[PDB]
């Protein structure tokens, strides 16, 4: 009656790969969701499914969104 555990994956290569691919997938999902539910642009003629761009909106005060840090 000696207990056993699950196989732990302590490998730096596969941990870097997992964190990288999860970050890339969540940022791709976020940008496709935000480009689909708003005004969109396109590099190609009538191209919304592949490479959708969030449309450029003008700010009333652009230095506040440019120069200010968001994580501090």
């Amino acid at each position: 009656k000696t207990p056993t555990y699950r196989e732990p994956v302590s490998d730096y290569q596969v941990l870097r790969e997992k964190a990288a691919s999860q970050r890339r997938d969540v940022e791709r999902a976020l940008t496709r969701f935000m480009a689909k539910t708003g005004e969109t642009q396109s590099l190609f003629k009538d191209d919304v499914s592949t490479f959708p761009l969030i449309a450029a909106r003008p700010f009333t005060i652009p230095y506040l969104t440019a120069l200010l840090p968001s994580e501090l």
């Binding site: 056993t4 555990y5 699950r6 196989e7 994956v9 999860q22």
Partner: protein, 102 residues
Amino acid sequence: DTKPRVAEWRYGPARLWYDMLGVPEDGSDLLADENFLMVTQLHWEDDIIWDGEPWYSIFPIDNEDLVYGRWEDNIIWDAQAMPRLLEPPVLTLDPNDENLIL
């Protein structure tokens, strides 16, 4: 006993529900066993295939809460007459699950 709800976080997952509620800060014979055996409740005939065409665990480890816990005690049978008082649960990030970095 009447359940008016209670919230202890307003800052973790479900903060949107807590804010909508406005809870500030931390302030708050057919029951015979055989009937339920899956031989008598499953169309296992569909499975029959006709003319088809260990130092670390070998097997996976199941959710202890699903396998053992009485989750049935979180079913709200009557909203007004709720037998016990439910309390807000904090996120517990289980590390047994793979696909979670930590």
